Amino acid sequence: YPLNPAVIFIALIGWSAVAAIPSNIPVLGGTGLTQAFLASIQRLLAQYPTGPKLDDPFWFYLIVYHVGLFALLIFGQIGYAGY
Amino acid sequence: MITIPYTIPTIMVISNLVGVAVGRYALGRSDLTQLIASMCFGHIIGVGIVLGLSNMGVI
Amino acid sequence: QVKVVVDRDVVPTSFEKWAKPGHFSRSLAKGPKTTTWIWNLHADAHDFDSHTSSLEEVSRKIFSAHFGQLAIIFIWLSGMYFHGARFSNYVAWLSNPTGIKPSAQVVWPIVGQQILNADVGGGMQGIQITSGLFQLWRASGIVNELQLYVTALGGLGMAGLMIFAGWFHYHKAAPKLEWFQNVESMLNHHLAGLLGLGSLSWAGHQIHVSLPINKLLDAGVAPSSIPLPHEFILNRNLMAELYPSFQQGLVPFFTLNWKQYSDILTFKGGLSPVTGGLWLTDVAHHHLAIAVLFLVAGHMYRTNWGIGHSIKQILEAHKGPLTGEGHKGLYEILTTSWHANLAINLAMLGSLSIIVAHHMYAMPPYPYLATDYPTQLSLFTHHMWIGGFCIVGAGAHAAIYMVRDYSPTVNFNNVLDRMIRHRDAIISHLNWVCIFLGMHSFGLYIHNDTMRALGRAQDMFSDTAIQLQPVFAQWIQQIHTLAPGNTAVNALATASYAFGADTVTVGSKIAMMPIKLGTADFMVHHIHAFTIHVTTLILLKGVLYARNSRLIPDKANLGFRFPCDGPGRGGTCQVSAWDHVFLGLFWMYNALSIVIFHFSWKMQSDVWGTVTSNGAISHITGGNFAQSAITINGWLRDFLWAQASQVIQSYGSSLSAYGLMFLGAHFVWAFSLMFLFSGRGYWQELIESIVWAHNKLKVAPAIAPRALSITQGRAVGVAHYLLGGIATTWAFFLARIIAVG
Amino acid sequence: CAETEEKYAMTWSSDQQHIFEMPTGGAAVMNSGDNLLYLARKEQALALATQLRTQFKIQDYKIYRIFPSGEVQYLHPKDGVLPYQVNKGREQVGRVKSTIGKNVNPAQVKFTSKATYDR
Amino acid sequence: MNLKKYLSTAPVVATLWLFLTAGILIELNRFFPDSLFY
Amino acid sequence: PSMPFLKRPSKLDGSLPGGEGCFDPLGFTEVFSLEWLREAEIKHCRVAMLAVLGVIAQEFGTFDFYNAKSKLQLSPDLHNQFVQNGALQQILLFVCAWEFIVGLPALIESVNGNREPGYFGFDPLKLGGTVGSAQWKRMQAGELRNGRLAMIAFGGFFHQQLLTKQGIIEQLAHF
Amino acid sequence: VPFAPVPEAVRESGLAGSEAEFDPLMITSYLPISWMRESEVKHGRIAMLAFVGTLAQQAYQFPWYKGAPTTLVGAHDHFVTTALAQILLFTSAFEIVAGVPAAIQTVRGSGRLPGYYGFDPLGLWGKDEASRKRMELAEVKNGRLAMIAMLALWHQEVLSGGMGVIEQLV
């Protein structure tokens, strides 16, 4: 049934680029939805055991980025329903 | 609401005309309900643009 | 198309057929040769899809019966407004609400029971309200007794319009089925007309009644200097003093300068620190949001004007690959079978009532509601209980669809029966989730029970011991702390004070404290997920095995309320789709009994109580949850042994009627077991051995005295197990919190 | 399973492609010309016989009982006519001479491998 | 005409008799309360 | 139409003693079968004629020994003077003797359709009590008209309270 | 192409009076014209009697309780609380028993001209001819003309200073 396992990265183009340049400042990230995340993962990626529940932009921009990224890749497989 | 120069009714009639431009497409019959439905939709869109334009930035 | 065809002079209105009991059922108009006709008369009083298969006549019967239900509800609310008028201390309660306990019902003075008239203050006594009517009347702005009398008499007026409406819509103007299967118009008027104009007009009442009145009562004005809601609309001048945006009129509305309406409407959230309720600016603004949002919502259903959807072209369009046919058939299921509609609407109605409970304890929306803790408790508890029962009504009427109104021709390869192709894989994984959650929700309690009993408290699941800090709930609660600055940009406070900032106290009574969730609250949430999954197991086993199981492959040929098949297959007692609902009512009692035993004991340990000098803290049990909810001896001892003590010592006082409805409800609970355990193969010739003693004295009753049937002889065990079981916690709870709060 | 339990394969024919309901559940395709149907146990099969026969005509139908040795059986009918209808081939077994009222008391049957009704 | 037949049924006359003897007990226990003699 | 009005030509009625016509603009006789309503019309108009003659006769100065009037409504001077007197009880109770006892079965006679729902007999008059066709119907319409005028007239005799606070004769003594 | 509008055809000609059939928007095609014609006539009434209500708003002999609220909105500001709520009530009383069976009778489908046949001490109206329909057509033309005159007399005070109507020409 999944006849088209074609592309996934078109969602990574499709979800980061639509969420980088709109900053919409006075929220947690003064930058965009993704720029507040890629800067806030490189501080923790080099085997840092920290990141508690008070680490806001790691957990919050973890879930809010995965929930639109999941939705846009699922809708990308819906992008092989019109065939 | 001000006159002919750029104001809140200036950015409403563009929403009304793109609304009826949708009404030429969404079962685009030329009846009453194209205007009463579709000018209502562009009216909704215009209200979403006026005050959403009012909060974040210049009106 | 949409047109209303109405039969006129359908049924004559004589009292002739009242003299024929069981006129309605040709299976039951034979008359009672046995006493089982007596109970089958009442078990077939509302089997409307068993009177006649003609859905027109059925649909007239039900649609006229709804007006009878609304007639009883308007008699009920007219009763509450009159008991508020003549009998309540509401006028005196409006002066000082934190001192005067709310009472309406004033017990008649017969032997002893005049002692139930509790001297609750206000100069006049009577038994104390826990239903919280006075908080909804202070919110609604009812000032003196006159609006309670007049609104009561309007309640009887609408009750007369619903009796006359139901008589009018069964007898002398009753519609056709083509009116009823016109369902895009029905949604089109209930989303928009009912709920839309309901929330909009209620925003009218709050802005033109409650905002001036509950601004004045928030300022502490006595209920004599308060003007009538009458007098705020003759002139805008009495409201421009209170809210200076009324001076501009509707002119900033029509120019869309809605910044000007920050006086009337806002987005603040939190609670009022003075009244302990929600800001009625936020609540009136809220009902405007439901107003415009639902009036948007109503207009998506094409009726006559070719603008809008139909449900058919929606459900056909989701022709998904893993379902094959898509949702084809559901518009023909839900517009020809009433019981399926009752399954959906009872599921969503019941879960809405649960949502109502959870949104009322933490965001107490009425003024001085979180101050008097019994009205805060019992409006969680009551809406939790009807919010339970309606889900079992979903699990029943889904099965009543599946037994009666299932037809495989309309229902062939769609989303529905493709479940039933793998209902073994549905119910088997519910079976696994039920065992896994039972081990990991109650085995933790036997664990902490043993480790506390074995002395090794180092091996428990406390905060000191092996902790089970709920990670996800604490994280998202921490997000809700960080809402009103970051994401709720135009807010001021959080969504509740169950989430964020320090507590709100009104009259040295803790209205809402931020609830802490550590390693005991965790395990009780797994109780709730567990006993929710068991009711989902019995109420999906009751539906997927409703029509044709693999044990009994003809259940639709047997029916819905059949008892059994026989001793064959080694015994097939209690196997019908009704009998799973019989089981899901006991699990309803379990699941909600530990929901409210989580509620009324975490919030007697972590929220409620008083505050003392220098803002110091005092709970009712005094923080005695996380060291005590982890076990069962802590649960049974420290909750059911300790909180009972104000129900049990309640004699000689006004709380003694709960001391009677406590023991009598233990009696009814214990009295159900006689019906549940035994069966009519005993009682039928026990009874016939008594029929010998009537035949000897010629006192043979002409209606032959059978015992109950099997399904009645277990339905009554449910209806006593729940009446006694629910009224135990009722009397225990109200006698607990009235005795302190 | 099929390697050790008696599978019940129900063979029947029809005239038009109707749609019936499986005893496993849901709607079935119901091949119009001729169709066999494997099942699990006999009550499913004769419950399907009631499912189709009480609705409409599905005659020339009977399950071939696939016992796991490999071959078939034939029960409903055997003489070709419907069981509650009366044919002059069937030999009655399973009777006694009178009601239960003359059946023997089980103290007369105690310590014997008899029945409470054979006499 | 046939309403009096409905007012002769079992539950209605059950309420019009147990309501009545109930009123005998309550009206006989307002006038002479606390009656343990006789 | 058969109505002397906008349009609803003889919805059910017309032969009843409405001599200027059949009024009925709202759908009550459409679904109430009209006999109940005719008894309600006639009984309300009788008791309203007694009401308005009661208000006039009480305003023309009769008390054995009671409270002075200053109004004949607004309970704790007039109506709740006599209830706490234990006085209007029996004059209600005999109405209970009229209504529950000899008016409720008569209303039952005004359901089965053998009543002509005025008619409690009751003509204690010689030379003018024609039971027949002409004077009985033209006098029943006269009872009906003076009774209806008693209904609205008693409405006006009640609601002169706000800018009156006084009697009706003293309302005539001021404009 | 019914002799008023642009080149677009109009279906409706079914016994309404005022035979021009000016339907640009085709609201006939979604509403019954007995209803809409009763809105034609019924708004026309208030246009008439409210037009001369403004022409007698500043005129000779009054009911004589006034002299200060001689304006229009000031009349609607002063009188609603005391003197005009029964101008509402004595037409709600006529309305719920007169207009409700009239409009609901015509949308129900009865046969009646929506003029709700009434008091007539004048008018020829006994000879069934084109004078009766002529007074229908002149009546509705005077109604819509008085109605356009009501936005005239509304916008002869708002963007003119709230002064009198007859004295605006000074």
Ligand code: CLA
């Ligand atoms: C916008 C119009 C409108 C409104 C307000 C309602 C409201 C309601 N409908 Mg309803 N309905 C409508 C249109 C409407 N309907 C249409 C068009 C259809 C046909 C497609 C139906 C078919 C329908 C069914 C089949 C059922 C309902 C039911 C209900 C009730 C749900 C109970 C409730 O919320 O109690 C809250 C109660 C109130 C808010 C009081 C409402 C009373 C006000 C005055 C509105 C009633 C106006 C009335 C409908 C106008 C009739 C015209 C006539 C007088 C000439 C509620 C009263 C259910 C019910 O209980 O039956 C009565 C039910 O089973 N409706």
Ligand code: CLA
């Ligand atoms: C307190 C009494 C009691 C208990 C313990 C249970 C327990 C259970 N019921 Mg239940 N039930 C009860 C009363 C009870 N019921 C009553 C009164 C009714 C009346 C209506 C029902 C009706 C009912 C229905 C209708 C269904 C169940 C089901 C289940 C099972 C749910 C799965 C689960 O939790 O596994 C976890 C097991 C436990 C929590 C039990 C304790 C196990 C401990 C934690 C571990 C083992 C102990 C120990 C180590 C054993 C080894 C030592 C020993 C060998 C010597 C579970 C075993 C469902 C079912 O079949 O299973 C899905 C089901 O469909 N029940």
Ligand code: CLA
């Ligand atoms: C079911 C709930 C439950 C749980 C979670 C525990 C847990 C525990 N108990 Mg225990 N206990 C329970 C019920 C439970 N108990 C009950 C009901 C009783 C009374 C009958 C007791 C009586 C008891 C005693 C008397 C003692 C404990 C002790 C302990 C601790 C050590 C036991 C041990 O070595 O685990 C053994 C664990 C395993 C063998 C692991 C099997 C399970 C694995 C994790 C499943 C994984 C499958 C995997 C997810 C598959 C997916 C992946 C795959 C597809 C690749 C441990 C915390 C001891 C202690 O001192 O506490 C510290 C101790 O002395 N318990």
Ligand SMILES: CC1=C(C/C=C(\C)CCC[C@H](C)CCC[C@H](C)CCCC(C)C)C(=O)c2ccccc2C1=O
């Ligand atoms: C006790 C019992 C009975 C016997 C219950 C009897 C038959 C009913 C007793 C109550 C009825 C209502 C008594 C009838 C009396 C009438 C009400 C008339 C009395 C006069 C006034 C009270 C109106 C069963 O039939 C039964 C069936 C299946 C499982 C368990 C049981 C079971 O435990």
Ligand SMILES: CCCCCCCCCCCCO[C@@H]1O[C@H](CO)[C@@H](O)[C@H](O)[C@H]1O
């Ligand atoms: C350039 C000229 C603009 C004139 C602006 C006038 C603004 C208000 C328009 C309506 C006039 C009446 O004003 C109403 O007054 C009533 C009460 O008198 C209230 O509803 C409001 O103030 C206005 O709606």
